[PDB]
Design an enzyme around this catalytic site. Structure first.
Site, PDB file in Angstrom:
ATOM      1  N   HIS A  41       0.810  -1.206   0.000  1.00 47.89           N
ATOM      2  CA  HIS A  41       0.000   0.000   0.000  1.00 47.89           C
ATOM      3  C   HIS A  41       0.852   1.268   0.000  1.00 47.89           C
ATOM      4  O   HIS A  41       0.358   2.344  -0.371  1.00 47.89           O
ATOM      5  CB  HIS A  41      -1.016   0.012   1.136  1.00 47.89           C
ATOM      6  CG  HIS A  41      -0.508   0.368   2.488  1.00 47.89           C
ATOM      7  ND1 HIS A  41      -0.178  -0.550   3.463  1.00 47.89           N
ATOM      8  CD2 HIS A  41      -0.299   1.610   3.029  1.00 47.89           C
ATOM      9  CE1 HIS A  41       0.192   0.118   4.535  1.00 47.89           C
ATOM     10  NE2 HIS A  41       0.147   1.421   4.313  1.00 47.89           N
ATOM     11  N   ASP A  84       0.059  -7.685   1.705  1.00 46.29           N
ATOM     12  CA  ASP A  84       0.491  -6.282   1.624  1.00 46.29           C
ATOM     13  C   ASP A  84       2.015  -6.138   1.632  1.00 46.29           C
ATOM     14  O   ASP A  84       2.610  -5.546   2.524  1.00 46.29           O
ATOM     15  CB  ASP A  84      -0.148  -5.498   2.768  1.00 46.29           C
ATOM     16  CG  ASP A  84      -0.003  -3.983   2.647  1.00 46.29           C
ATOM     17  OD1 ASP A  84       0.378  -3.487   1.574  1.00 46.29           O
ATOM     18  OD2 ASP A  84      -0.329  -3.288   3.671  1.00 46.29           O
ATOM     19  N   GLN A 177       0.691   5.662  11.518  1.00 46.33           N
ATOM     20  CA  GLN A 177       0.826   6.270  10.203  1.00 46.33           C
ATOM     21  C   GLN A 177       2.257   6.816  10.001  1.00 46.33           C
ATOM     22  O   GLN A 177       2.837   7.496  10.845  1.00 46.33           O
ATOM     23  CB  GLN A 177      -0.228   7.327   9.979  1.00 46.33           C
ATOM     24  CG  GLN A 177      -1.616   6.739   9.609  1.00 46.33           C
ATOM     25  CD  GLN A 177      -2.213   5.684  10.536  1.00 46.33           C
ATOM     26  OE1 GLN A 177      -2.515   5.993  11.706  1.00 46.33           O
ATOM     27  NE2 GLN A 177      -2.389   4.439  10.091  1.00 46.33           N
TER      28      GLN A 177
END
Length: 224
Positions: A41, A84, A177
């Site tokens: 991603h 991922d 994040q």
């Protein structure tokens, strides 16, 4: 990283920062002189030229050796959060030596055992939704959470055999994040996963979810 401490020089010889458009974005792991492993991603479908890798530094913005990308390959079964991982090829080869080295990988078919101690590292936010991020690399140690417990948290379908989970019930220690794609290692410093996803950051009873190197060795080995 939430609840972390500063990594020491040489803690993760293989860790790379992945800048995008000049700013913080992801982490990764240097597999060999022209290859980085990261989360799919972080890179899928984006302009490749926007990325810059840096190895051999505790900072994202100076030190060590940089490279642009020559190519990006996501896992052939990447879909949603599942599978991922991506292999990046580097335009500039990066030699091992000093504080740069290449990762050793979790064995094919291995699966981290619940309760064992894992360490994750990155340049991401220090709180959920935080805007500011640290200059130097942070790390945190969290126990593996069983896939069964993780499926209790997230749902059965949501956690696959190519994911594993780690965190504490009380929360307060996690990746966040900006940490995506960077390494999670076992207690031996063997690379067991890449930061992938979770429900917020460091929340009680919501583990961090990691793409599993042991489960995804065929892809890694084929294209590294």
């Amino acid at each position: 990283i939430v609840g972390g401490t500063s990594a020491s020089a040489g803690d993760f010889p293989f860790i790379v920062s992945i800048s995008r458009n000049g700013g913080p974005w992801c982490g990764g792991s240097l597999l060999n002189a022209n290859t980085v492993l990261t989360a799919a991603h972080c890179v899928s479908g984006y302009a490749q030229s926007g990325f810059q890798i840096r190895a051999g530094s505790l900072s994202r913005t100076s030190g060590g050796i940089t490279s642009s990308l020559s190519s990006v390959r996501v896992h052939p079964s990447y879909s949603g959060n599942n599978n991922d991982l991506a292999i990046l090829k580097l335009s500039t080869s990066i030699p091992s030596g000093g504080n740069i080295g290449y990762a050793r990988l979790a064995a094919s078919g291995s699966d981290p055992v619940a309760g064992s101690s894992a360490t994750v590292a990155g340049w991401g936010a220090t709180s959920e939704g935080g805007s500011s991020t640290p200059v130097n690399l942070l790390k945190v140690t969290v126990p593996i959470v069983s896939r069964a417990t993780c499926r209790a948290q997230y749902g059965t379908s949501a956690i696959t055999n190519q994911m594993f989970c780690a965190g504490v019930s009380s929360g307060g220690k996690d990746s966040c994040q900006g940490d995506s794609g960077g390494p999670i290692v076992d207690s031996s410093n063997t690379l067991i996963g890449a930061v992938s996803w979770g429900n917020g950051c460091a929340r009680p009873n919501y583990s961090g979810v990691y793409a599993s190197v042991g489960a995804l060795r065929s892809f890694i080995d084929t294209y590294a």
